[PDB]
Amino acid sequence: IESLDYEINENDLFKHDWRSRSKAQVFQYIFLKWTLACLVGLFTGLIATLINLAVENIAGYKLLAVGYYIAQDRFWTGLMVFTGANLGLTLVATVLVVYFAPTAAGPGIPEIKAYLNGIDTPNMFGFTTMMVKIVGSIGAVAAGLDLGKEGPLVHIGSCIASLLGQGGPDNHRIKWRWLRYFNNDRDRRDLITCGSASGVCAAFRSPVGGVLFALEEVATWWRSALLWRTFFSTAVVVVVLRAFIEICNSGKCGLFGSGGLIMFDVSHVEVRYHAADIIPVTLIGVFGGILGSLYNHLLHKVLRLYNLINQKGKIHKVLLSLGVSLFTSVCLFGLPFLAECKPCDPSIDEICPTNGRSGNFKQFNCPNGYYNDLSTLLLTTNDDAVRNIFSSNTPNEFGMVSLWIFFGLYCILGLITFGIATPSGLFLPIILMGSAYGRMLGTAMGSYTNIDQGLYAVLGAASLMAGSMRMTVSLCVIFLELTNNLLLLPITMFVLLIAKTVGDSFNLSIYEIILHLKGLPFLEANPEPWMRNLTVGELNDAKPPVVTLNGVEKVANIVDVLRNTTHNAFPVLDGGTELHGLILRAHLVKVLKKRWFLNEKRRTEEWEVREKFTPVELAEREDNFDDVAITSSEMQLYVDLHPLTNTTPYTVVQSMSVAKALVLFRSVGLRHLLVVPKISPVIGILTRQDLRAYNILQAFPHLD
Amino acid sequence: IESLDYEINENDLFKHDWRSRSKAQVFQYIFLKWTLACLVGLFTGLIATLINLAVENIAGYKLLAVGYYIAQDRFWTGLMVFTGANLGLTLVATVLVVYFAPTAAGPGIPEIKAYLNGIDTPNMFGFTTMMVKIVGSIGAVAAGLDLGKEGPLVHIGSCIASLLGQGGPDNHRIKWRWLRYFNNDRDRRDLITCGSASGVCAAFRSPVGGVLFALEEVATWWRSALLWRTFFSTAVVVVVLRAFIEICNSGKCGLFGSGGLIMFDVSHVEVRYHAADIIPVTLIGVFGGILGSLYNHLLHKVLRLYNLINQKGKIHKVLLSLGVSLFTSVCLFGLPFLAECKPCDPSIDEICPTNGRSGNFKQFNCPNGYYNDLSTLLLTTNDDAVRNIFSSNTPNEFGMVSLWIFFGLYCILGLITFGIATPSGLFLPIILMGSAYGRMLGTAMGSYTNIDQGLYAVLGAASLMAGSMRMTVSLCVIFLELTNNLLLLPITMFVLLIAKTVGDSFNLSIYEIILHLKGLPFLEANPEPWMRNLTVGELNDAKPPVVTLNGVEKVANIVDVLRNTTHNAFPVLDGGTELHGLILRAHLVKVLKKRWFLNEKRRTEEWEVREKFTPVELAEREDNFDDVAITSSEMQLYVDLHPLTNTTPYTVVQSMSVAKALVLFRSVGLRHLLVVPKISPVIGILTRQDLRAYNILQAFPHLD
Numbered sequence A, B: 001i002e003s004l005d006y007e008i009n010e011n012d013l014f015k016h017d018w019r020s021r022s023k024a025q026v027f028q029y030i031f032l033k034w035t036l037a038c039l040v041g042l043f044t045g046l047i048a049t050l051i052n053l054a055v056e057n058i059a060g061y062k063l064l065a066v067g068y069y070i071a072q073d074r075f076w077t078g079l080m081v082f083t084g085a086n087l088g089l090t091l092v093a094t095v096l097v098v099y100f101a102p103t104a105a106g107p108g109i110p111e112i113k114a115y116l117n118g119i120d121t122p123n124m125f126g127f128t129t130m131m132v133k134i135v136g137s138i139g140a141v142a143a144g145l146d147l148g149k150e151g152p153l154v155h156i157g158s159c160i161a162s163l164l165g166q167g168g169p170d171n172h173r174i175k176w177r178w179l180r181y182f183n184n185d186r187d188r189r190d191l192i193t194c195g196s197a198s199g200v201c202a203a204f205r206s207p208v209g210g211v212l213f214a215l216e217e218v219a220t221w222w223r224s225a226l227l228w229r230t231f232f233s234t235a236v237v238v239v240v241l242r243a244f245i246e247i248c249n250s251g252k253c254g255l256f257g258s259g260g261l262i263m264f265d266v267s268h269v270e271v272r273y274h275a276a277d278i279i280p281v282t283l284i285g286v287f288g289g290i291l292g293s294l295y296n297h298l299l300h301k302v303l304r305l306y307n308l309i310n311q312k313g314k315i316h317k318v319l320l321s322l323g324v325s326l327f328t329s330v331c332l333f334g335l336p337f338l339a340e341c342k343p344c345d346p347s348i349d350e351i352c353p354t355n356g357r358s359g360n361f362k363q364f365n366c367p368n369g370y371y372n373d374l375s376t377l378l379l380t381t382n383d384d385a386v387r388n389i390f391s392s393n394t395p396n397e398f399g400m401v402s403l404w405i406f407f408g409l410y411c412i413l414g415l416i417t418f419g420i421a422t423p424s425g426l427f428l429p430i431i432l433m434g435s436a437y438g439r440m441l442g443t444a445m446g447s448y449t450n451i452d453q454g455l456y457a458v459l460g461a462a463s464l465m466a467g468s469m470r471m472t473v474s475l476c477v478i479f480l481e482l483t484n485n486l487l488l489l490p491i492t493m494f495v496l497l498i499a500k501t502v503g504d505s506f507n508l509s510i511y512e513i514i515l516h517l518k519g520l521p522f523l524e525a526n527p528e529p530w531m532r533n534l535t536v537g538e539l540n541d542a543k544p545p546v547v548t549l550n551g552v553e554k555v556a557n558i559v560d561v562l563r564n565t566t567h568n569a570f571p572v573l574d575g576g577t578e579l580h581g582l583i584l585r586a587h588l589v590k591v592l593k594k595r596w597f598l599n600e601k602r603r604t605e606e607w608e609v610r611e612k613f614t615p616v617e618l619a620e621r622e623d624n625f626d627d628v629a630i631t632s633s634e635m636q637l638y639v640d641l642h643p644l645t646n647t648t649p650y651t652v653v654q655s656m657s658v659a660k661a662l663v664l665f666r667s668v669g670l671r672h673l674l675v676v677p678k679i680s681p682v683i684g685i686l687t688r689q690d691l692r693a694y695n696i697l698q699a700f701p702h703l704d
């Protein structure tokens, strides 16, 4: 799996630096760079509100059809309707994925985290992957599964960004010339960062939470001119989302519009800072670190198991998805018949019990005047279950045994649902599993505290999310703009830090674990302490030698180095040997396809390559080597490789440490890094495969 | 003015990489790195609450003494008391600055913005500079000047961080050995970033606003392991600030405790999204961009004028400060006698008029039942004037002429007060000057809008602050956590973007303008479009040649290159010439002071330099060259410069563009950057002075 070309070519023929164009062209580029950051936000807002409209309508008219048979004391008919509707929606949402785009499974972040690190993950931002991600997300979260549209919205935002960047689908591009400036690999990284923050803001209705999510976790080369377009895109997202909530008020769109603007609003509690509430807040942090470590350690084993079932065919995936949906629906209907009914309390002031699709003290098998504390949490859409656990001013609503049963159910569903072949997510199961033990500790303290148990559920959700994803700033800002409680922001990040620096003492993160399972070559930020005692010359003394071309290279050597080798960049020498730089494989296949062949070893002028090539044709990667067949009489001609050479590559000397070379490699971009000698002017090329610690430790095992 | 040594030395003798120490030492380092990030937050919270306690007590007992003579219809006695108390407080706050630490003047950011870019700004984070910054900030903002403790709190946080880093004041350091790990220049940059975000969070009571302020504007080398300590420090700051607000409730600390937790709370408005309120919000943005551009262009001329008065002696500074305070007090008392009294309205529901030190419809010369709309804004501490302009549910409280008079006064005071020799600031004058025209447009629209005029004042303040400082994310998060209005966050950054991308079309920022006035060599992020068509070899073909030392260099050449040259790093050769790397001046003076002299040209072993030096002694920069006198008989001995050489420097070749060399230079750190030839193995050193565009354009003026 290859990498991406971030390094700028400084030749005049390529016109890579956009400031060096004309004035009309820099006007058009500076207008299109903001028009696309507007349209990414506009379309991510429209598509997330379409997902929310369809999901709320489907889950509402499923739960109303369940409650109509609940109210007539027909429990088995309601169970058959529930399991049948869940099985049909999960069947559609996994048939589309396993038969039309098998890369749509899973969240999408653990890959966009690797695309923005330079790894060219293939077939990830297509058009059919976006459409089956949308329909699979609708049919998967409207089937009551323990997933969430939280994750897939990041991947849908990235696909919207890339389809706007290349001007449509991969084979139906519009031939607008003004989109020729975004054919690079730096503009794609900028657009996909805008789309990923656009997706996080569409998921959580939090603008700068999404900006900080793309800043801290997903992207890795942050620019201050990128911080102003990500800003604009999350702004247009949350404007479009709140405007289409406000238009669909008063039931003009059926359901979807009885919910409000901020999602899990608990901004009415006025949390205080008592000194006997230091012990339970650090207990929330310590237990969130331990449970996030244990949850990562078990989800690693579960995904290792699911990698065996995914290779046994395209029908074992569908059977696994339907079995997970069947077990989910059977548990979510049969488990609330174990918790006994507790009577209402008039000190809570909310209406209990309640019959309908909404939360707030639901009953389904209790007599009149009682309410079921399990069916408040189960038998509901998961957007309302977490509103029931974040319920301000509800002392002792849920018992200890019912919260234990809900916790022990959702810590199982979070393991077995993530990794199935439907578009899943990982924010919502951790939010539910964290709110469970947060309100468990809230009910366990009781009168010896002053923070509300709903805020203990918020602290439990944030503490498990930190202990399982190792994020600090994005989680505190996201929980601020989910909960609207500004006075909770100190204590809710005092709990994130204890959760993260307890969870770091046991395991890795979960994105690093999913990146390690998928084998993606992610370059870590800081080098190891043993990388400083190893030099680059010792690294190239354990490698095959560099293959090079000269400047006016014969066609036979170009064809030989293209057929026999898989390398994507070759240094150019002159055979007094003067190094020129690197030339890419993508330009070797271009001069072979263009029939730019010379008779003698003449080095050309500039106007010949201006007449042959154009700056737009040099960035089209729509080529392969198999279709071109060179005549064996014209394999003795000559190709002038001078005007296509990246004549200013980044070089290190053969005594630099591997640590400093890795720091340069990751800080600049740099698919390729030459190695010139200290005083054959090239003695090796370092790439991403050579600077990862797992490959270096296999060659020199006496280091660690 | 020199630079800082960020580049890590990879030798075993220095022990710069902290992971390569022992296990006990890495435990002690990982404990102290968080203990200092705790103590920075704890002490910045305690010192900002001491500033707030003293400022509120002094300004309260000054305004009560003014109001006691206002209520007895004695206006001239109140004017004499007001002008005398302001003149005494400004006299103390400028005498301390001009006679004890003249670097305490001005905000503090435009320098911490340059210290974190590597420029070693001298005498900036001392102990007397911190103490006179504290007392000057108290005596300057309690004198009613148009400044603010918003800025100086960044510099006080940075000084607290550096005094904790070096273990006390600059000549009273404690001799604790466990503070030897923070003697580097990377730990100082990390600590000062924690202290700067600590200061912004202590100023605005906004944690992640301060984190994003240190992320976007102040610091320039952001690390994800730094994002977790800045987090902790702003957390402890806002916890200590809110706890010492809550302890000082019910008047146990005199005043300071009748204000609340969040400062300018306007979270009761429920802003809507009408479609006829797109024209005035973009008018707020356009006028904020134009007024921020014009305010920068005039403050540049005013600071150019003040540079003449500052050089005419230490008494012209005091006369300028007292004249500014006199003009301020005469205007703030004499201007409200021009606005006529308007009667009360019962539809506003707040108590009008009010007599006291607080805001909310103040009267001072109106009869009973009326109120003065200018003295609501003037004659009050500026922390309450902006609460009066951000007043939710007050339609048409201030007229048009009174708001025009307040605007035309504060746009003059913001020019003439910033730059005087007291510890000033720049957030509060822009907040006041922006709220003025924000509520002016709110009163000008009237019934043709639905957003409250207090929210138009918030939009005007944010739009002028963006048009004059060119910040986006930090301003929207800071205005969120000042105003507590989460539903204002979309429109309040839709106005910041129009303000910033109108203001960018005219001028620079204001930090770049103050950095350009002080002549500090700030390295910009992206290179110019002409820097790609210039190579490093052409840069070194217009420079004096590199001076070098050999490896076992005689003492006479070391003394000659230390006396005759001012360079701080010399390449080491061997005269077959094998490059070793760079050696610093700070180690040349160390081997000259240590008397590590050899008789012959023997290259030593490792154990000799282990016996002479220690890893702590090699980082002590407490030396100068004038005190050491070498005997002329021992100037023919030899110094082994091998084991102190930075043997892995960052090298480029002599055909790299200046653009790519600048990108490497700024992305890695790098005080010094060698230039090795393509195929005398060194042909130059590039530093910060060579890669700035202003120095390159003076040598090759045919480029632009």
Ligand SMILES: CCCCCCCC(=O)OC[C@H](COP(=O)(O)O[C@@H]1[C@H](O)[C@H](O)[C@@H](OP(=O)(O)O)[C@H](OP(=O)(O)O)[C@H]1O)OC(=O)CCCCCCC
Binding pocket: A019, A030, A031, A032, A033, A034, A035, A223, A225, A226, A228, A229, A232, B494, B497, B498, B501, B504, B505, B526, B527
């Ligand atoms: C409503 C919200 C905003 C509304 C306004 C919509 C436009 C808007 O929000 O920003 C305006 C845009 C700014 O462009 P933007 O900041 O995205 O682009 C960066 C900017 O040009 C910097 O000045 C560049 O650095 P330098 O100079 O090389 O040092 C940087 O180069 P690099 O990072 O690539 O190295 C650029 O990426 O351009 C204008 O100011 C002129 C107005 C024409 C744009 C009009 C397009 C609609």
Ligand SMILES: CCCCCCCC(=O)OC[C@H](COP(=O)(O)O[C@@H]1[C@H](O)[C@H](O)[C@@H](OP(=O)(O)O)[C@H](OP(=O)(O)O)[C@H]1O)OC(=O)CCCCCCC
Binding pocket: A494, A497, A498, A501, A505, A526, B019, B030, B031, B033, B034, B035, B223, B225, B226, B228, B229, B232
């Ligand atoms: C609110 C409570 C939270 C604070 C208290 C808890 C302390 C706390 O919040 O962080 C814990 C601390 C994390 O240290 P911290 O994250 O600051 O340090 C980074 C961390 O060690 C990374 O793993 C390093 O990267 P790598 O590994 O090289 O890849 C990185 O290296 P570099 O960036 O330098 O290159 C380090 O800077 O680790 C402990 O368990 C120390 C015992 C804690 C004792 C401290 C007690 C105060």
Ligand SMILES: Nc1ncnc2c1ncn2[C@@H]1O[C@H](COP(=O)(O)OP(=O)(O)OP(=O)(O)O)[C@@H](O)[C@H]1O
Binding pocket: A001, A002, A003, A543, A544, A545, A546, A547, A548, A566, A567, A568, A569, A570, A571, A671, A672, A685, A686, A687, A688, A689, A690
């Ligand atoms: N002439 C050469 N060009 C490029 N790589 C080379 C060459 N000679 C040896 N290598 C080494 O061969 C290994 C495999 O290289 P590979 O074919 O993956 O290059 P690549 O596909 O361009 O790498 P990537 O695209 O992942 O940056 C690398 O570790 C590289 O160091």
Ligand SMILES: Nc1ncnc2c1ncn2[C@@H]1O[C@H](COP(=O)(O)OP(=O)(O)OP(=O)(O)O)[C@@H](O)[C@H]1O
Binding pocket: B001, B002, B003, B543, B544, B545, B546, B547, B548, B566, B567, B568, B569, B570, B571, B671, B672, B685, B686, B687, B688, B689, B690
């Ligand atoms: N041997 C040398 N070492 C360092 N700089 C040199 C040398 N020879 C020439 N120069 C040049 O002389 C100019 C002035 O260098 P200066 O004395 O400011 O170095 P410096 O003080 O170490 O720089 P800084 O500390 O700002 O990084 C620089 O532009 C540098 O390029």
Ligand SMILES: [Mg+2]
Binding pocket: A001, A002, A003, A566
């Ligand atoms: Mg490859």
Ligand SMILES: [Mg+2]
Binding pocket: B001, B002, B003, B566
């Ligand atoms: Mg110097």
